[PDB]
């Protein structure tokens with residue numbers, strides 16, 4: 001048998017992590033993440049996870065392959081996935097406003113992907129916590145649902161992006177031996193993503209501009225201390241604009257956000273309870 | 283791109299194919315899902331650029347591919363058309379020069395694995411045997427199959443025993459593996475297991491070296507004392523209860539080379555693991571033997 005492995009690289013992202021390319025395999029678009037040597041452990045962790053459980057879910061970025069190739073004086077590490085031409089939710093929210101149906105569809109699809117990660121299924125999958133959930137790690141699909149990407153920090157039962165760190169991460173009180181601690185860190189981050197999306201939902205002719213969480217209280221590339229002072233010491237939370245309280249959908253989403261942001265991690269809603277709440281909105 | 287041309291091995295591990303890549307033969311190992319933890323471990327080990335060595339099987343690529351619920355696990359290496367030492371020893375006898383070239387090359391590969399470079403961690407193999415040694419056209423061999431390897435760095439005080447329920451080939455297991463008293467958090471324990479197995483491989487090779495117009499037939503270690511397809515408990519009986527070691531044919535004692543090799547084998551087979559020779563000391567001893 002011939003095994004056609006050639007991928008043509010046709011660049012949609014570049015960072016410290018490495019690069020992401022739009023590629024072609026057998027006439028089909030794929031996404032190719034090429035890891036920097038600095039972030040090899042992210043390739044190893046995602047690969048170890050997919051070797052343990054082949055996740056398949058409409059709201060999880062679809063795995064195609066993990067490739068290690070020997071070079072001259074180095075190892076090349078590629079992760080190949082489904083390609084989502086609309087790009088990340090972070091991207092999408094800058095150039096689009098949302099109606100009620102499109103806002104709910106986005107956030108319920110993210111909750112669905114997250115609840116799938118979190119749930120242990122016997123026979124199935126281990127429970128999984130993401131540990132770096134944010135709008136840049138969510139892709140928009142043509143059908144209006146999203147999918148969650150980047151399991152390089154995931155844990156089965158590098159640090160997370162500081163802007164999205166839960167208070168117990170910033171004050172180093174997280175119970176590191178307790179798997180449920182990691183789910184609760186994801187729920188905090190989910191709540192910040194819900195806030196990012198809800199701002200872009202139009203009501204009564206009003207919308208907020210795209211901003212990242214805590215844009216008004218921390219610098220770009222905020223330090224660990226900058227975040228700890230805001231979230232732990234002062235106990236600040238993202239602003240809920242008055243205009244949301246004229247709209248029943250945004251009023252319900254504001255309540256949901258609040259229940260993801262309790263200082264006490266064990267008070268936070270579960271991903272399954274968030275899904276249920278979202279199915280009863282509208 | 284790779285063309286799979288012919289199956290050269292098929293068992294519970296999976297299958298190995300001879301394939302073609304850029305005009306060249308390559309070996310393509312397709313793992314069974316039962317052995318997915320070996321695939322991942324081998325991939326971790328081959329990420330070490332300073333692992334590369336004339337007497338370690340050369341890595342080309344490692345892949346995990348999936349669609350729907352079906353996962354394929356591939357390892358692509360150099361291809362050695364002479365096959366494994368296990369295959370070769372059934373087909374040929376050896377002269378002194380060939381016997382020493384083979385066993386020194388295996389010692390050279392094993393010392394390369396065991397010694398930390400400040401780089402490459404120290405590595406213990408845990409499944410050394412004649413089927414896991416490939417014969418090269420230059421008369422040297424290379425060690426294959428790092429799916430059970432343990433890594434250690436003295437420089438950072440880290441030991442990585444991996445997460446693989448696979449155990450070594452039963453016929454080659456040291457007494458402390460068979461009696462399950464091996465100290466699992468001690469890196470030197472795993473090197474000493476490799477030394478026991480190396481001694482067995484030395485014995486397999488030496489039997490095929492002619493002296494005074496005499497050679498022994500190829501036999502695997504403990505062929506005479508265990509059932510075919512021996513169980514863990516079959517091996518524990520002969521190695522641990524019966525304190526059996528491979529017999530040294532008396533014809534070896536006429537030949538200086540085989541007398542030296544019998545001495546080296548015996549120093550790999552002490553019941554006390556800490557009494558066993560190191561891979562470096564074996565390499566140095568074989569460099570001096572003719």
Ligand SMILES: COc1cc(-c2cncc(-c3ccc(C4CCN(C)CC4)cc3)c2C)cc(OC)c1OC
Pocket residue numbers: 002003004005025064065066067080345346347354356
């Ligand atoms: C190694 O590397 C890459 C391989 C591929 C790829 C290309 N064609 C065919 C395949 C294939 C899938 C599955 C089987 C089955 C069929 C028979 N069954 C009984 C067991 C095995 C065979 C072949 C693959 C896996 C794509 C790649 O990239 C997209 C690869 O590189 C990452």
Ligand SMILES: COc1cc(-c2cncc(-c3ccc(C4CCN(C)CC4)cc3)c2C)cc(OC)c1OC
Pocket residue numbers: 012013020031032033079080081082083084085086087088091136137138139149150151
């Ligand atoms: C988050 O993480 C990963 C994501 C992806 C991924 C999959 N589909 C599409 C993309 C994409 C395409 C295009 C744009 C646009 C954005 C606007 N403008 C700047 C031009 C380009 C952005 C994003 C990506 C980045 C793949 C990954 O691995 C292969 C990821 O890592 C796990």
Ligand SMILES: COc1cc(-c2cncc(-c3ccc(C4CCN(C)CC4)cc3)c2C)cc(OC)c1OC
Pocket residue numbers: 025028064065347348349352
């Ligand atoms: C990695 O990704 C892609 C792979 C492929 C692909 C190419 N050759 C063969 C296969 C295949 C055939 C048959 C089996 C099974 C069927 C049942 N039983 C008998 C065991 C064996 C598995 C696998 C596939 C899945 C195509 C893709 O897209 C068109 C892939 O996606 C980019």
Ligand SMILES: COc1cc(-c2cncc(-c3ccc(C4CCN(C)CC4)cc3)c2C)cc(OC)c1OC
Pocket residue numbers: 290291298309310311339357358359360361362363364365366369413414415416426427428
């Ligand atoms: C041990 O382990 C691995 C080995 C290999 C590998 C590399 N060159 C040649 C071989 C070979 C070729 C042919 C025969 C013949 C011998 C006589 N008779 C029995 C018919 C068959 C045996 C052996 C192998 C098996 C590749 C691997 O990975 C790709 C290995 O796994 C790490």
